[PDB]
Nucleic acid binder design. Structure first.
Lengths: 186, 82, 30, 149, 129
RNA sequence: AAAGUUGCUGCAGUUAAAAAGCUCGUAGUUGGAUCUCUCUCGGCCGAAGCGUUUACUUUGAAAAAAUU
């Protein structure tokens, strides 16, 4: 179930693989979960001692994972205690090519491997049932940015309680301050 | 006068503006689904379609192209989609 | 009306007056 | 403003912010690509392919669904012409205007507009020579103009 | 056509400030424009701004406060050697206290005081007083 | 030098000197947004490939006196 790029499975992703194994034994998600695999898992803190789960999955099977998102979210929240699980693909940040680097650059880095592209794709992957319909960057008096995300209002009833976890996850694995908002109209 | 929030325009003003000149541009057209009067099949037609749209099974003209919005055949039923 | 010489002098003098006034105001902030 | 006209019009297409495929579209990427292949085998310019796919099948943006634009999709399979479609349409228009001029010698307006057209041809040919689409020995000549169409 | 979008942004802000407006919209956005606006922000001249992100070059809505007399671009981007810097401010600033030559240097986009402290030169972008 | 009557800084071209009959019409000038160091041999180091090339900026060497 877990195929790490470092191929050192820890007990966290071991328990996650056991959990998806238990779901593939029993639930209706049998024609999907058997073929699919994950790569890593992580358990972080958000909202004053609230644990949240980040499941790092491979990119090209990501869309298949996108088809079965909310069922796995609900069943893994039933399996564990009061928690929150988000599905974020494993992306590689290639460093910016400066004029001092190793001679492996016989070919340019693709644009999808940059910092901003991967960060925006992570923000896209983090909130699946809602869709990012707008984005603002408020630049404060200190010189510090604050990203505000306008989401789809049709799916607010599933993600209205996860916005704190979304902000905490994005701060943990990005370092940028993000607030989530629902517009009154489109 | 000289005192308004440009960051938060109301729906009536942002609707009223030109489609490029809004805060964030957005189209005025839409995709709509059409039932032929002589059948039951669903056809997804652009509102501002430039091609004459034939039914895939009945070959009846659903819409005729005009300068702007497409002119549906009388008898056809249409619904706004998404 | 009046020659442009003293209009230029008056404009540059009033401009230096705003420069001095804003200098004293910004010095007062420390 | 216009490259040869004194007009300055705003009218164009405006793409929405949502790059995601809508939920109501049940067509997969390969089905859309197969439609593109059969439309190109019918003999259609990528512009015509995009218009037909937008109108009849409901595919709003081919790049948003398939991931590639129409010319690249046709190029990977190999169903793409040697000279690009805008240059083709310009050369076809120049051939038509030159035919009208050889039949009608008094039309100095037609001469002026033909000069406009073949100047547009020269600019587009310079661009395509710079980015290696046309061979460097390619040159637009008046008698060879109908031979390209 | 449109070249040097920073000039357009600075002219828009200056014309908005001269009419006593409070808030202005700027299109298109740029990295150089955002860095210049941050420089004017830290010195307390243009208050607050927020970047509207569409999938094009973005836009910026800037909250004007009232202190700004004139913000201006310098075109072309003249090289500013560290000696020549002194001459430049005597050409552009109405005093030796306030006003700002903005330079892009290899240490970043900054003002002439900070460029003198970091002991570097660069290309001149503008001034604001 | 006053002189911004040669104007790069820094002029003008409705009525005072002055914008070409008008547009397609190569060169030259200007051009939208975007991308956060190591491999061998000799004592952690030295040699080697530089890392795409520059422009730009800072540092250092070197560069007659007299004149300033």
């Amino acid at each position: 179930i877990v195929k790490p790029n470092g191929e050192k499975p820890d007990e966290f992703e071991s328990g996650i693989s056991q959990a998806l194994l238990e779901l593939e034994m029993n639930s209706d998600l049998k024609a999907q979960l058997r073929e699919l695999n994950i790569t890593a898992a992580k358990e972080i803190e958000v909202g004053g001692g609230r644990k949240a789960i980040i499941i790092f999955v491979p990119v090209p099977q990501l869309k298949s994972f996108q088809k079965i998102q909310v069922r796995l979210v609900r069943e893994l929240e039933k399996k564990f205690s009061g928690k929150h699980v988000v599905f974020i693909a494993q992306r590689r940040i290639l460093p910016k090519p400066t004029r001092k680097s190793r001679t492996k650059n016989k070919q340019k880095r693709p644009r999808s491997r940059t910092l901003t592209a991967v960060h925006d794709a992570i923000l896209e992957d983090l909130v699946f049932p809602s869709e990012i319909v707008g984005k603002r960057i408020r630049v404060k008096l200190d010189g510090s940015r604050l990203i505000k995300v306008h989401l789809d209002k049709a799916q607010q009833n599933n993600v209205e309680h996860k916005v704190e976890t979304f902000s905490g996850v994005y701060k943990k694995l990005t370092g940028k301050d993000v607030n989530f908002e629902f517009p009154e109209f489109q | 006068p000289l005192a308004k929030d440009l960051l938060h325009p109301s729906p009536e003003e942002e609707k009223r503006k030109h489609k490029k000149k809004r805060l964030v541009q957005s189209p005025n057209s839409y995709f709509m689904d059409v039932k032929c009067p002589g059948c039951y099949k669903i056809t997804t037609v652009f509102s501002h379609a430039q091609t004459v749209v034939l039914c895939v099974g009945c070959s009846t003209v659903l819409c005729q192209p005009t300068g702007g919005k497409a002119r549906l055949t009388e008898g056809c039923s249409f619904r706004r989609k998404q | 009306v009046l020659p442009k010489k003293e209009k230029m002098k008056l404009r540059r003098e009033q401009w230096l007056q705003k420069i001095e006034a804003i200098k004293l105001a910004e010095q007062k902030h420390r | 403003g216009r490259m040869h006209a004194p007009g300055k019009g705003l009218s164009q297409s405006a793409l929405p912010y949502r790059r995601s495929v809508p939920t109501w579209l049940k067509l997969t990427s390969d089905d859309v690509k197969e439609q593109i292949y059969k439309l190109a085998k019918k003999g259609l310019t990528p512009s015509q392919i995009g218009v037909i796919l937008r109108d009849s099948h409901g595919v709003a943006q081919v790049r948003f669904v398939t991931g590639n634009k129409i010319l690249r999709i046709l190029k990977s399979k190999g169903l793409a012409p040697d000279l690009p479609e805008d240059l083709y349409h310009l050369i076809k228009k120049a051939v038509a205007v030159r035919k009208h001029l050889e039949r009608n010698r008094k039309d100095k307006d037609a001469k002026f507009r033909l000069i406009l057209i073949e100047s547009r041809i020269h600019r587009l040919a310079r661009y395509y020579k710079t980015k290696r689409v046309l061979p460097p020995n390619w040159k637009y000549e008046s008698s060879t103009a109908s031979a390209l169409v | 056509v449109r070249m040097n979008v920073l000039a357009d942004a600075l002219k828009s802000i200056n014309n908005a400030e001269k009419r006593g407006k409070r808030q202005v919209l700027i299109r298109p956005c740029s990295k150089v424009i955002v860095r210049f606006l941050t420089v004017m922000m830290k010195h307390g001249y243009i208050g607050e701004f927020e970047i509207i992100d569409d999938h094009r070059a973005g836009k910026i809505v800037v909250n004007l406060t009232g202190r700004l007399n004139k913000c201006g671009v310098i075109s072309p981007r003249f090289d500013v050697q560290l000696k020549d810097l002194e001459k430049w401010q005597n050409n552009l600033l109405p005093s030796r206290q306030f006003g700002f030559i903005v330079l892009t240097t290899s240490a970043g986009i900054m003002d002439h005081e900070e460029a003198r402290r970091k002991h570097t030169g660069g290309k001149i972008l503008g001034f604001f007083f």
